Amino acid sequence: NDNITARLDRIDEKLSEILGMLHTLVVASAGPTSARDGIRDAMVGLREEMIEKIRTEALMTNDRLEAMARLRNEESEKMAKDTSDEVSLNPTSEKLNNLLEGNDSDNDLSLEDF
Amino acid sequence: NITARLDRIDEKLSEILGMLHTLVVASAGPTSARDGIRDAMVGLREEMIEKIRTEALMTNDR
Amino acid sequence: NDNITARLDRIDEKLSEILGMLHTLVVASAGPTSARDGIRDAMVGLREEMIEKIRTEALMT
Amino acid sequence: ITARLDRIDEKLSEILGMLHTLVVASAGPTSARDGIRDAMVGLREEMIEKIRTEALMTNDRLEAMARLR
Amino acid sequence: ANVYLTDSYLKGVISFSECNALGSYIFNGPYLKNDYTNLISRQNPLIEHMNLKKLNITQSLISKYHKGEIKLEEPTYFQSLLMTYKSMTSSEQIATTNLLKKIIRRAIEISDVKVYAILNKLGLKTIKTTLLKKLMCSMQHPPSWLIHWFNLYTKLNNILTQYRSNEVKNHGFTLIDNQTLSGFQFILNQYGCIVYHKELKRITVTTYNQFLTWKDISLSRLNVCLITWISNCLNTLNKSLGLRCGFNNVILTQLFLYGDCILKLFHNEGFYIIKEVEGFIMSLILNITEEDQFRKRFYNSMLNNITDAANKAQKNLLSRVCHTLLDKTVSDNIINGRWIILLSKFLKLIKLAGDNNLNNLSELYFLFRIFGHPMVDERQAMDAVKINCNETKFYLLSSLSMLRGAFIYRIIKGFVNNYNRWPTLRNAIVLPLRWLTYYKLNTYPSLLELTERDLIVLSGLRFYREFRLPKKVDLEMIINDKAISPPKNLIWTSFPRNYMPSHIQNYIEHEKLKFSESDKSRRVLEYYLRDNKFNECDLYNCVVNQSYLNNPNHVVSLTGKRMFAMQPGMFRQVQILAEKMIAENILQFFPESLNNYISKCSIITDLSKFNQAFRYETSCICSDVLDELHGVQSLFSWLHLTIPHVTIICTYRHAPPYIGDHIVDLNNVDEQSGLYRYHMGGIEGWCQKLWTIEAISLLDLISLKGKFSITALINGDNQSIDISKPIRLMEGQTHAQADYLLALNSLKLLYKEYAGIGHKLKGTETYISRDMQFMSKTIQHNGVYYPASIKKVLRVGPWINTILDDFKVSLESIGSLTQELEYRGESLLCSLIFRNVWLYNQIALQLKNHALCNNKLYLDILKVLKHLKTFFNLDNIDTALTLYMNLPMLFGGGDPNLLYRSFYRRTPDFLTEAIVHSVFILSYYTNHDLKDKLQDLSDDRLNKFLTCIITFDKNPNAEFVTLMRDPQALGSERQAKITSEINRLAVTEVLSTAPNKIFSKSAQHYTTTEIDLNDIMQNIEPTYPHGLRVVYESLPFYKAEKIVNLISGTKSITNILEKTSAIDLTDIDRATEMMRKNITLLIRILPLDCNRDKREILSMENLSITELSKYVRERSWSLSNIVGVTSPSIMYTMDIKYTTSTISSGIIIEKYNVNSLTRGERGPTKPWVGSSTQEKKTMPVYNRQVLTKKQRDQIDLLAKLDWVYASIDNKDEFMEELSIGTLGLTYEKAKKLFPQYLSVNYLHRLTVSSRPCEFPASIPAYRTTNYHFDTSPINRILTEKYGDEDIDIVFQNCISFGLSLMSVVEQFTNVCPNRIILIPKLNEIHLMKPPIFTGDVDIHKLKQVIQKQHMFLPDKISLTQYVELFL
C-alpha cells in the first residue's frame, strides 16, 4: 500500500513549500509616497526583492545599511558596538577624563577669566 | 502510521492559518479605513448587528 | 476508522479557511477605486439584505 | 475513501497559486503591471458570502440569547 | 468690575517665540532666531508690544542702543548677573541681617512649645528647653552665603509684589524700577520684561514667566542654604538630631556659580549640558554599589553622553545666532575649545559635594531643579518628531504573528485565571489537537512548555464579545479644567488677528456663522455647558457607527506645555473612552503594569520616545483582539486609522505659519517649520496603556526565546527588567563574570527583539546592572532607602498652591510640604524649624501686603491676638502669636500640623486629636504634667478653654445632608468653613442658566433635592454618619455634587460663560469675607466670660477627653446619640515606660538590632505597613463581565446598605425602592447578586470612602524591621475588663505609635532604647456595639430625590443582560 505513503509525501512536500515561502516574507508599513500627496498601502514582498527595493532607494529610508543588515539576519558593527564588552571613549571624552583624573590643577581656569 | 501523518499535516495547516490571519489583520490599515473597505476584511461584530436588528424589528413603529 | 475520517474532515475545514483568507487578501490588495467601490456597494447591499432577512424571518408569527 | 487525499493535494495547489499572485500584486508598480490593477482572477463574491455567513452566525447567536427574554 | 490677578510662581512655560517677537519688534531685527515670528512681529506688532516700546524710558534706551553704546544679550547673561548681585550699602547689610536674625529667633521660639510638650510626654527632660537654648546660641550669626540669597529673594519679591498690587488696582500698569536692586533697571509688565545694566552697558528683553523663574531660582537656593544651615547646627548639637546628609555650604555656592557660568557661556543651549549631570550622580553612586565591569561600562557611557551633549550644544549655538542681533555675543572660549576645562571644574565640585556618601549623593538630585528652565522652541521640537514619525518600517510576518500570539496567550491565561474559563472562540477549528484539549479542559500550558510555533498557532484565533460598552456617557470622565482645540476650519482663531493675513480675517468671520456656540468654545467645560443638543447616548452612537472616521473636522494642535497635543471634542471623547475601557477591563490580565549557579542581572530602559516607532501594523494586531472582545470595530484602533489623514500644526500664540494668499484650508497650506502631514502614528499620552501591555507581551516573547526568566515592572515611561537564569559555572569563573555575561547576552536579545518590531534602542536609554535599581527616583541599597527630601521643599514660600491667595490653603500647603523632612528625612526638629520659619514669614510679614485685601487680614489677626492676650492673661502680643501659631486650625488657630501626625499618619476622629493637641500645648503655660492625670492646679486656663469648648449656644441646620457630605462635620458654627461651602450657591445659580438642559435642570432642583436628602433619614433614632455616607453615595445626587465641587474650584465662577480671564468683584468680595470670618473664628469660639461667669467651671477630676468630644459633637448638632465616630487618641491614651514592670500590662516594643543606633540600618523583622483587616463576605456565583463597572459598584453599595440597616422597620420598602430606582430590578431579583457579610460589627468593619483603610507609622518602612512587638498582656487585661465585647480603640495605631516612639526617642537622646512599654488609660475606652435602629425611612422623599436628579443615574440592568447572568 505505497499509495498512501506516496500521496502523504506529496502533501508534505507542498506543505513545506508553502511554509517556506511564508517564512521568507517581509511586510513594509504604510506611509507617505514620494512627492508627498497621499498614503501608500503596506507592501508584502519576498525578502530578496524587498532588500533590493531598500538598496535602490525605491522605498525611501534613512538607516539604509542598518535596515538591510537586520533583514538579512545579521548584525552590523554598530550593533556590535552598542552591545560590546567594554565601551570605548571618544576624543573629547578622553580629554575630559584626563582632566578629571588627578587633582594636579591641570584645568587652569577661574570664573574671572570671563 | 497514518494518524501521525494526519496530525503533522494539521499542525502545518494551523501554522499557515496563523500567519495568513495576521497578514489579513495587518493589511487592513489606514488606507482601507479611508477607502471604506475595512469591515469587509475584519468582519461584522455584535454592536453593528444589534443596530441592524433594532432597525429591522422597528421598521418605523414596530 | 473514525479517526482517519474525522481527521480528513478537519483538514477540509482548515483548507477552506485558508482559501477564504487568501481570497480576501488578493481582493483587498486592490488599490484603485474600481474594485474598492465594488466592495463598498457589495457591503451596502449585504446590509440591506440582512435587514430584509431579519425582518421577514421575525415576521414568521 | 482513503484516497480522498487526492482533493487535499489539488487544493494545496490552488493555495500555492494564489499565494504567488499575492506577492506579485504588491510589487506590481512598474514591474508587473502593464495595465492598472494587474489582471486578477475575478473573485470577490466568495469573500462576500464569507462575510454573509459569519454575520448570520453572529445574528443567530444574538437572537438566540434574545429569545429567552 | 473685572480685575486681573497675575501669577506669583511659575506655572506655565517660558516661550521662545514671545521673547523673540517682542525683542525683534523692540530692537528692529532678528533677536534670537531668523524665523517667521520676527518678521510678522516687526510687520504687524501687537498692541502690548507697541505700548512697551512707546514708553519714554524704552525710547531713550533704544536710542542709546542704536548709537552703539549698549550691547544686546541673552536672558542667561542676566541670570548670571543677577545671581551674582552682591552690591549693598552698610545700611542694607545691617537691615537684611537684622531681619533674618529676627525671623530665626521667632521660629525657634515658636518651636519651643511643641518641643517642650513632646519632651514632657516622653518623660525625657523666653525659651524653656535646654536643647533650643543651645541651638539659639548657635544660630545668632547667619553666614554670608545665606544673607546673599535672602537679600536677593527679598528684592525680587518686593518688585513682584509691587507689580501685582498696582495691577489689581489699575489695569495696564507697567512697573519702572531702578532703585530696588541697585545697578539694574527693570521695566515689568505682564507682556514682557526689559532689563538694563548701566555700568556694564548691557540690555536684554525677556518675558514675565522668565522673571518668575528668576525669583523662583533665588527662593530655591535660599531654601537649600537654610535647610543645610539648620541641620548642620542640629547635627553639631547631637548627631541624631539633623538629617542623614551633611553638606559644606561654601561648596554648594561654588556649584551654583559654576552652573551659572556654564549657562552664560553656552546660551539657552547650555541646558542640554545641565541635563546630563544626572548620569554623573548615577555613576558616582554605582562606583559605590556595583562591581568592576558594570560600573566601568556605565562610567564610560556617561562620559560619552556628556561630551556629545556639549558638542551638540556648541554646534546648535553657532548655527542659531549667526544672522541675528546676537552674533557678536558668542564667547571666544567656545571655538577655542577651552569650555571643557570649565566643565571639568563643575564635575569635580559635584564629586566633592557627594563626598563618597550615598546620603549626600542621593540628596544632590536637587541640583537639577536649581538652575531654572529653558525657553522651548516649539517649531523645532515638531521638526525633530517629524522625521521619526514619517519613516517606513520593515517587518517579518513571523515577528508580527509571534507578538500577536503572545498577546492572545496573555488574554487566554488571564481569562482562565480570573473567570475560570477560556474566552469564547468563533473559529476553534484552527487549533490542532493539543490546544483543543487545553480548550476543552479549560487549562493552559506554562511558558516553559510553550514554543514559538504555539504562538504562531495562537495568532489565528478570533473571539466573541465578552465585555460591554456603557450606553450612557459618564460626565465626570469627560469634564475637565483644561483647554480644547477648535475644529479644523476654525483653527486660525488660535493666533492674534494681527498675525494673520487679510484674507484669513475675512474668512474667519464668515466661517464662524456656520458653527455652533459649543464648537467655538476654547475650553472643555465651556464646550460642554454650551451644548443645547446634548444626549447621554451620543458617545455610544459615535463609537458604534464610527463617526470619527474620515471626518473633515480633525486636526492636531501642539503647544509648548513636552509638546502637549490637543484635538476637537468628539475625538477627545473617543480617546478617553478607549483608554478607560483598557483600564477597566483589560489591565487585570497584565499585573506588572500597575545547576550549580543562578545568574542574575537587571536592565533599565527609558520608554519615553517609545510611541514614535509604533505603526498600525504593530499596534493594531493587538488592538484588534481588544476590539473583538468588546464587540466593536476601530474603537481601540482609532489613532493609527485617523491621524495619518490630518495636519499637525503648532498653535502657540506667537508662532503662526506662513499662509500664501488664495489659501484658507489647513490641509492645503504648504508644509514648513511647525506644520506637517502624514504622521504615521504615535502621539504621546494618547493610547499609552495599549503600548504598555504590548511591551509586556514582547517581554514574554523575549523570555521564551532566551530561555531565562523575567520580572518586568513598567512605571510610567521607565521599565526595569530582572533576568534570572540557571547555569553551570566553568573552570575559574566567578559569579560576577557569570552575571556580566548574562547581562550582555540578554542585552543583545533585547536589542534584536525590539529592532524586529521597529524600535531601535540606543545606548543612552538602556543600562545594565545586577543588584540595584533607581526605582522611579528611589535609591535603595541593601534594604536601606536613601531619600531626596530636599527636592520636595524647594518652592516653599508664602502664597503657594492656592486660589485668590487664600490664607488657610497657603498654611496647609506649607505644613504638608514641610512634613517630607520628617516622613522621609527622618528628622522631626529640622522639619519643625523650617516649617516655623516659613509660617512666621507668611503670618507676621506678608499678610499685610495682600493683593486684594491690602491690610484687612492683618488688622483681623491683630484683633485675634489681643483677644487671646486678654483671654489667656498673657504678657504681650508676642506671646499671643507664639500661642496662636500652636493652636489647631479646627478651632480657628494657625497650626497646620497636629502632634499625632508625628507618630502615626491616620486617625479616625479629628476632634479628639485637636482637643488633645490643645491640652498638650496649653500645658506649656499652665505647667501641667503630661505623665500624671488631670487635676486643677491654681490656674484655670485649661479649665477656661475646655469650658468654652463644651459651652455654646445651639443652632443646627441641615444636619443630615451635612453629615452625609462630611461625616465628621461639627455644626452650630463650631468650625471653619471651606471653599466648597461658600461657592456652592454661586455655582448652582450660574449653572441654572446654561444652554445644556442637563446641567440647567439639575441646578434648578438643587436646593429642593437638598431639603429632601435632609428629610429622608431623619427619623432613624441613633445617627450613624458613616451609614448616611453610604445612603448618600448610592444616589444620583452624588454625581451632581461632584461636578459642582469641580466647578467651584476655579477662579471667577461667575465669568465661566462670559469669555474673559478677569475676575468679577463679587467673587473677590465673597472670598475676602470668607477669609476674614475664618480669621476671627477664634474670637467667636472663646468668649471672654465662658458664655457666663456663673456657669460652674469645668472640674478636671475624673475627666475623659473622649466623653467630652462625644458631648461636644452631639450638642453641636442637637442629636441625642451619634454612634461610630468617636475613637480615643493613642497619643493621649498610652503611657510610656522604659523599665520592665512587675507585670508589663501593655504593648511591648523591643529592638532586635544589635547597634545602639538604627537610623539607616536594616533589621531581621518584617516591615509594618498598617493593612487593615480583610473583609469576610460571601460572593455569589454569576457572570461578572456581563455587568459594567458602575453597575457592580451600585450592587456593592446596596449590599452594604442592606447589611448596616437590616434592623429598621421599613427595610422591605426601602430596599425595594432603591433597587427599582437605581438598578431596575426588584428586591428579589437583585438580592441574588448581593455579597453576604459574615461579620456582625459594621461599626468596626464597614468600608466607606470616609474611613481610613491603612494605619502606617510616621517612619520609613525599612526602619520598622528593627523592632518587634508583643500585645499579649494588654489583651489579657482588656479581656478581663470587658470580655468578648467590641471596644473603640484601634490596634494598628497603637503599634504605629510604639514604632515611631522608638524612632523619636533615638533622635532626641542619641541612644535607641532596648524596650518601650505602653500602658493604657482604661477610662478612655468604651464599647462599640452595633445598634438596633428604630424608626423608618421616608419613601416619598427617597422617590423625590431619585426623580429630580434622574439624569445622573447609571445604566439599568436589562433583561438581555439579566438572563445572561446565570447562563
Side-chain angles (χ1 to χ4, degrees), chain E residues 1172-1286:
Chain E
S1172 200
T1173 58
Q1174 182 183 92
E1175 193 55 78
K1176 300 292 184 290
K1177 57 175 168 175
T1178 303
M1179 283 70 71
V1181 178
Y1182 64 97
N1183 302 339
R1184 253 89 182 176
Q1185 80 273 9
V1186 179
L1187 309 169
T1188 67
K1189 195 194 172 181
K1190 292 184 286 294
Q1191 295 174 348
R1192 286 179 262 153
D1193 307 353
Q1194 187 72 18
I1195 287 177
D1196 217 321
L1197 278 166
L1198 268 62
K1200 285 174 172 78
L1201 203 57
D1202 191 46
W1203 179 36
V1204 167
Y1205 283 113
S1207 199
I1208 71 174
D1209 37 355
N1210 222 19
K1211 194 203 87 83
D1212 277 352
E1213 300 184 357
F1214 183 28
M1215 291 307 298
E1216 176 88 36
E1217 216 68 5
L1218 266 174
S1219 303
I1220 280 282
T1222 43
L1223 294 168
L1225 312 170
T1226 73
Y1227 187 42
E1228 303 78 58
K1229 298 303 168 298
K1231 207 179 180 179
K1232 295 168 195 164
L1233 319 179
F1234 285 178
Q1236 295 283 328
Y1237 289 87
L1238 311 173
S1239 298
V1240 286
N1241 211 346
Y1242 39 87
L1243 293 186
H1244 277 184
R1245 311 231 169 181
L1246 176 69
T1247 61
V1248 196
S1249 52
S1250 53
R1251 305 190 59 189
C1253 52
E1254 198 213 357
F1255 296 93
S1258 285
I1259 194 176
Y1262 87 85
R1263 180 96 185 264
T1264 60
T1265 57
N1266 296 266
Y1267 319 109
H1268 163 87
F1269 55 88
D1270 187 53
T1271 59
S1272 288
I1274 191 181
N1275 211 301
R1276 300 164 203 155
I1277 308 170
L1278 282 179
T1279 297
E1280 304 298 328
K1281 184 179 178 177
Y1282 305 95
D1284 196 74
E1285 268 172 326
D1286 291 334

Side-chain angles (χ1 to χ4, degrees), chain E residues 265-293:
Chain E
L265 184 65
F266 307 89
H267 297 180
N268 202 42
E269 273 73 21
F271 287 98
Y272 297 162
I273 305 168
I274 288 293
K275 206 184 56 181
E276 282 289 345
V277 306
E278 319 175 20
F280 193 69
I281 307 284
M282 297 170 57
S283 300
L284 291 174
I285 287 160
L286 294 188
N287 276 253
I288 293 176
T289 75
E290 292 286 333
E291 61 95 19
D292 184 67
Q293 284 143 310

